[PDB]
Amino acid sequence: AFDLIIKTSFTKKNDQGTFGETKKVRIQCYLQLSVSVEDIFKKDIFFFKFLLNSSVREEPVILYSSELSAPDTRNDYNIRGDYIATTPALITFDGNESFINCYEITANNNFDSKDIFNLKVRYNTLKEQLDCFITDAVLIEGDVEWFILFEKWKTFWELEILKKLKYDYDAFKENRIIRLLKTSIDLNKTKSKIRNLCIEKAVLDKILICLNKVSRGIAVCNTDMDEYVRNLVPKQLTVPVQLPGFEQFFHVQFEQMEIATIGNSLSYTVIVENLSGQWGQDVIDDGGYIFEILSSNEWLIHGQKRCAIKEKRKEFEVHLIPLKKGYLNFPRVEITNINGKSCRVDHSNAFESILIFAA
Amino acid sequence: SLLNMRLRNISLKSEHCILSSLDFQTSKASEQLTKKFIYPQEHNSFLKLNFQEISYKLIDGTSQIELDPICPLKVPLTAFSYDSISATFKLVLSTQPHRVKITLAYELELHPNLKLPVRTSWETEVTLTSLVNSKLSNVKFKFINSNIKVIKGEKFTMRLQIINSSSSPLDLVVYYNNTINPIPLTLENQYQLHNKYRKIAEGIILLSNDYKIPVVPPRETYFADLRFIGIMSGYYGTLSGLKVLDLNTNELIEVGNGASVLIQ
Amino acid sequence: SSQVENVDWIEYVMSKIRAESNLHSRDFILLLLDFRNSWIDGIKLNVQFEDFTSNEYHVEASHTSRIIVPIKKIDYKKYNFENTPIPRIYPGRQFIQSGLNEEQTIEMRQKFWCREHIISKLKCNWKLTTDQSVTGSVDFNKFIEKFDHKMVYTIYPGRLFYGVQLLLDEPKVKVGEIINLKIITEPTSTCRRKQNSTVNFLDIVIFDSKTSKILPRSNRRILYNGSLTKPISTTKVSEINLEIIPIEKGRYEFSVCISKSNNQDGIIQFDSENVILSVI
């Protein structure tokens, strides 16, 4: 946060005088919302997963829409999974409230790992929304003759008192009670400040009882405060994101041959093929791309545990032998390059289990 | 010696055997020697090992006998650089360690003219619950068919063997508890625990609840003919709830550990 | 399934749900009665309820037989046991308080009326095995003890706080397709007076069904928009919905867990209701 001085020297035509004020402001040059991408690859469909999160311990934010716009480079991928919030969704710095925004992308011809996608998430801080709530609900409830009187000091109200308030965000997160912290603002001097200003008596009175009431902790949670964000401008955080760079893409499929008692061979045949043509990059059927079935403590592999991929499509048999009692996952697999390169693996049935039923 | 190998045998008390699994792979020496003399001018060369015969032989003194593998192993197999082939052998198991020999006869096939033979070999030794007993007592329990699979909804029967040899007859009473065990952990693990306890509680019912097993005289046996019926599809491995109470010292031994009911 | 229709109770439940296909299988409970024969000879039992009759059970001497008799759950929407004082069968005596605050008396009232519901509805007959013409009957007022907390939770769902309800579009979908599920939630009479509040949170925790293992929170199998946790009002019926997207083949359970607040412990109820979807 930094300070800024603006100074104007504007002139009018009806009068001869040269007017112009000189204001000093404090600007918050910090990004409240934080985003972290996480992607999943599967055969011919691509998945994004953005874990949207706040970036400050005591400044939770609220979300409205997070539609991911496709790039304008061409009639490209058809995106599917845009999110429009019926009501604002609250997110805090960290906890068991992981906000996930997921997208499913299907290509028309092929993928290219040089395009740029734009997220375009719209949001607001909870402080701003609740400030609108207090200044529209607890103070000007269904009144016009009073609001026209109060309009004189609206800019003061929204700048010297409303901005200085501190809201019990923990209390709101727990019980949705709109209460201030103990060391939020000292009314004994705030009343003196307003008294020092030329102010109408009833306006002073209503501001005083408003501050006292909200210090007492009014706790309207969901019956209201969902029709007041209409007049609140949203912030927007269009952020770019790109697919990760990699050299080759493989997918491995275990096919059953011809439930399964312990200590008995299960005949499986693995099918490994370099499906890199789908993603633009041409196949490399001679690279040092050793493929190995990681032997765990619950699966004994019989056959070719490891072999070097030097063909577009490779297939070979393998017999699995379980060790533990029941409901075991398939053995993990990995394709790693020998020199320095990286590649992405699509285990077709990573999360699938066999029920071993002994004897 | 680009045939670095290992033997990582694992015991199996369920079927009463030990599974010895040799796994031989091309070592880093193959990588070092490939680009030195095998094909120096080429950029991506590979070895062409061919295995004439692999033997896993059980030996005791002067006698020896070959052991076949679990699944078939096609003997005249090829092998290239960066390979790992493993074979598994089953031999039945106290304090008498075994003695085994592994011999791999193979040959490199540099060009289809010459073949250098190798006969590397080495000897070594094969070195590294369902039955439930009663604490502070000698009575012992075992299910005749601890591994039962039946269609869900149908009532089934499970035959519980009691061994009594301690001093005197027992008045043990068996029951299944159909109440959710109170939980004691984060929300994730705590809800996992609650779901497990609920599934245990209202999954199976014993149609002879609170059966008074009449008498089990000393140095004799008895068959508690328990009768069940399931109502939730699932795999109830080592099912809890089926706990037998002894009305002599208030033993609450968990007799259900030797049960592996599966119902669709 | 339909293969095992031989025993009486399963067949009764099936005919009821099939002939009146709006009730789910959740709206049924067993009673698990156990008749102990203390007579020298055997007796044939025949237990009866609202509509169905159980087949004959031969109970020989000095041996207990566990009888299954299903019951339809009683709904608090049309019984109002909350405000219905226990009848006084010999009125005219002046009124002296036993001494019980609101919670104790409402608990006792619910237990008593819950017990009384299934006494004026359940009966059984006799046939002595030796002489077939010694028929009779047995009452249940002098055998059925007072209920406990679990017995009231299972039969009377008004004791619980929220009567949530789940449903899907269809329980069959291919890989990579939005399929929303909507969770209806009506508070019960217990919640409207037991605790003061305006918001309670619930979770949409997901299980593997087959392995019966809970999936992680930010998993790689089920992708959804928005947080699983979200508030619900404690006074009005609240409807929520999600944007489940399957990723891999399998089955999932989609249970629900209502909590008072997002501070570790302090969970109101773990509802047992769940709806399964199989993706393939």
Swiss-Prot record, chain A:
Its main location: Golgi. GO terms for cellular component: cytosol; early endosome; trans-Golgi network; TRAPPII protein complex. Keywords: Autophagy, Golgi apparatus, Transport. It comes from the Eukaryota. Part of the multisubunit TRAPP (transport protein particle) II complex composed of BET3, BET5, TRS20, TRS23, TRS31, TRS33, TRS65, TRS120 and TRS130. Interacts with YPT31 and YPT32. Belongs to the TMEM1 family. This is Trafficking protein particle complex II-specific subunit 130. The gene is TRS130.
Swiss-Prot record, chain B:
It is found in: Cytoplasm; Golgi apparatus, cis-Golgi network. It comes from the Eukaryota. Present with 1660 molecules/cell in log phase SD medium. Specific subunit of the TRAPP II complex, a highly conserved vesicle tethering complex that functions in the late Golgi as a guanine nucleotide exchanger (GEF) for the Golgi YPT1 GTPase. TRS65 plays a role in the YPT GEF activity of TRAPP II in concert with the two other TRAPP II-specific subunits TRS120 and TRS130. Involved in cell wall (1-->6)-beta-glucan synthesis. Part of the multisubunit TRAPP (transport protein particle) II complex composed of BET3, BET5, TRS20, TRS23, TRS31, TRS33, TRS65, TRS120 and TRS130. Interacts directly with TRS120 and TRS130. This is Trafficking protein particle complex II-specific subunit 65. It comes from Saccharomyces cerevisiae (strain ATCC 204508 / S288c) (Baker's yeast). The lineage of its organism: Eukaryota, Fungi, Dikarya, Ascomycota, Saccharomycotina. The gene is TRS65. The chain holds residues 211 to 560 of 560 of the full protein.
Swiss-Prot record, chain C:
It is found in: Golgi apparatus, cis-Golgi network. GO terms for cellular component: cytosol; early endosome; trans-Golgi network; TRAPPII protein complex. It comes from the Eukaryota. Its main location: Golgi. GO terms for biological process: early endosome to Golgi transport; intra-Golgi vesicle-mediated transport; retrograde transport, endosome to Golgi. Keywords: Golgi apparatus, Phosphoprotein, Transport. Specific subunit of the TRAPP II complex, a highly conserved vesicle tethering complex that functions in the late Golgi as a guanine nucleotide exchanger (GEF) for the Golgi YPT1 GTPase. TRS120 plays a role in the YPT GEF activity of TRAPP II in concert with the two other TRAPP II-specific subunits TRS65 and TRS130. Belongs to the TRS120 family. Present with 259 molecules/cell in log phase SD medium. Part of the multisubunit TRAPP (transport protein particle) II complex composed of BET3, BET5, TRS20, TRS23, TRS31, TRS33, TRS65, TRS120 and TRS130. Interacts directly with TRS65. This is Trafficking protein particle complex II-specific subunit 120. The lineage of its organism: Eukaryota, Fungi, Dikarya, Ascomycota, Saccharomycotina. The chain holds residues 1010 to 1289 of 1289 of the full protein.
